[PDB]
Structure 1
Amino acid sequence: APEQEMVQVFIPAQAVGAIIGKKGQHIKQLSRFASASIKIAPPETVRMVVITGPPEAQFKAQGRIYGKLKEENFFGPKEEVKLETHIRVPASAAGRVIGKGGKTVNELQNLTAAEVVVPRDQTPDENDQVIVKIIGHFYASQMAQRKIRDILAQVKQQ
């Protein structure tokens, strides 16, 4: 059964208008395209897009956010869109995302050219989960997320 995941994508504050669209048109139809729930989180004081859905939904929705930002010239003419994404992993599995000595997060970064960072002083949330930070282009971020998901599923069996 397609399990659901929640991802937080940070976008430039000024881009919220193009993601939402007039009368919310763009964010509704993006939800239908991806078959995902897609929400702009309230400002704490970048803005955070919260995407909830299974992996294929995540791919479609995230793909369209990177694409919309590209199309609106939010970055630059020669500039690939690079965004920060936060995902949550079991605390008991974070040490396996890092690897012994740090070898798996290193391999991740070398394979994808995404920057992947597990902050080390975290308090697990009420679901015993901690943040992994992913910064990169669309493909790099997708590949980091897919790999981390596969690591988690491995730890779960064993």
Structure 2
Amino acid sequence: KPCDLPLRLLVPTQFVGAIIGKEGATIRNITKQTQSKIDVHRKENAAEKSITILSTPEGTSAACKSILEIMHKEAQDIKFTEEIPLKILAHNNFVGRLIGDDGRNLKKIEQDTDTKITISPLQELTLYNPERTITVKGNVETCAKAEEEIMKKIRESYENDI
């Protein structure tokens, strides 16, 4: 107690500049306000960079929601009309509670949030990337609530491992 698995996101490279901000001001502000460690890494491919967030369950969600706001706000200013999905990366070993019983908890979460949630096919991953991509289509507030309940279920697998 409490759980130590990070939230990993895949965000479009479009919106990374705004998430970091000028002089790294935006990202630092989010780490202060959420007490998180946020690190932005290139990803071998997709035109996306990964964002790793180590914090408490709640600060993680607070940080995720801020990133969703900034992404959506940035999407307005470059006239990006499409809905920007939230893509959570989750290690395959810890997705059993989401995909288990014909994806019951996945569809449960869909219904509770008004989101369309899709998980990348097992076959798509490599030995260099064991993380499944969980794509949540919705909107800022609905994607963030969806992140809370997805990461709850991912942490349930992790904390009931063996």
The answer to whether the aligner puts 1:134 opposite 2:119 as a matched pair is no
Q: Distance in 2 between matches of 1:157 and 1:8?
A: 19
Q: Which residue of 1 aligns with 2:20?
A: 20
Inter-CA distance 80–36: structure 2 relative to 1 (3 Å threshold): farther
Q: TM-score with structure 2 length normalisation?
A: 0.71
Aligned residues: CA RMSD: 3.4
1:51 to 41, 46, 53: 53
Greater mean alpha carbon deviation, residues 109-118 or residues 35-44: 109-118
CA deviation after TM superposition for structure 1 residue 50, in Å: 2.0
Q: Distance in 1 between matches of 2:83 and 2:110?
A: 18
- What secondary structure does 1:41 align onto? strand
Contact 1:70–1:80 under 8 Å retained in 2? no
- Where do 5+ consecutive residues of structure 2 fail to align? none
CA deviation after TM superposition for structure 1 residue 43, in Å: 4.6
Q: How does 1:7-156 map to 2 (within 5 A)?
A: 7-44=7-44, 46-72=48-74, 73-74=76-77, 76=79, 82-88=84-90, 91=93, 94-114=95-115, 115-117=117-119, 119-121=121-123, 130-136=131-137, 137-151=139-153, 152-153=155-156, 156=160
Q: TM-score with structure 1 length normalisation?
A: 0.72
CA deviation after TM superposition for structure 1 residue 80, in Å: 8.4
Q: Distance in 2 between matches of 1:51 and 1:148?
A: 15
For residues 64-120 of structure 1, the C-alpha deviation after alignment (integer angstroms, 9 at most, x for no partner) is 11222233325758x6863332242562x5333223233332222233233131533
- Where do 5+ consecutive residues of structure 1 fail to align? none
- What secondary structure does 2:39 align onto? strand
Inter-CA distance 132–11: structure 2 relative to 1 (3 Å threshold): closer
CA deviation after TM superposition for structure 1 residue 37, in Å: 0.8
Q: Percent identity between the aligned chains?
A: 19
2:95 partner amino acid: A
